[PDB]
Amino acid sequence: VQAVAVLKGDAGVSGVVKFEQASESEPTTVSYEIAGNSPNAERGFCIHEFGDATNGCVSAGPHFNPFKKTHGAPTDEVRHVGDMGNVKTDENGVAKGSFKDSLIKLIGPTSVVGRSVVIHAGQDDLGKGDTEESLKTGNAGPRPACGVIGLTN
């Protein structure tokens, strides 16, 4: 399977995020290319529950979290399925790279197809800040861009 999300908004940020998973027990390879960000920064990157774009990135809902855990880092045992942490932007505001993840899936009951990918205006505190918003969201701030994960070839 292959899925893709075109990130858009009215804040100068835009990008494309690709997903690929061969079989359900296999890890998904997420590849991203995102521009218009603040230079040399770290930005919260995550999958939200709804692929609803009726109201900007707002209608995307909360973090995709079928197992009802607290927000954490991609490498934490306890994290939301949709937690992809922070992407690093370069001298020109571009975030580009890829990684594999064992929780994010395109196949099965927790598939991310039809959900949203969101790029934040701030840095995710990886659930390590010591407030309650930390365990909820990671305090990454506003959602400048987002996109519904659709199927493709």
Add this chain to the structure above:
Amino acid sequence: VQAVAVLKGDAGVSGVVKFEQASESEPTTVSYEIAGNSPNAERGFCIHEFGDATNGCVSAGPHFNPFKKTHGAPTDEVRHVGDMGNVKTDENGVAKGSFKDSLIKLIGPTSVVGRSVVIHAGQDDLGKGDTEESLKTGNAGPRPACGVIGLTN
């Protein structure tokens, strides 16, 4: 289940299309509200295979047709699963209404979640024109707007 698609493009046409199905053997209720069309006209309305928006409405691909049939009318025995025929626009270019369909589904192997909904600039010939494009597409013309069907509550 409930799904939604926000139709967009650079041609003045925009809209919202909602989908709802309770159980898989039950018919899906499609509801639409679309503006910016030519007044008092009929426009081809359909679900395309891919929810890829990387290249306008082009990257949506061909009509969603898992059973490899020819293009036809929503009430034809032979039609593509994604064939929703023509929507009627009013004196102000608005298409608004709803209907139920037994082939379109949000549940199961032929789910339309993660695929695209496309509004055409022309009228669908319901596969009754006598050319080869008729059985392929319905000759509905350009795709002024489109959107990926995402999940919602």
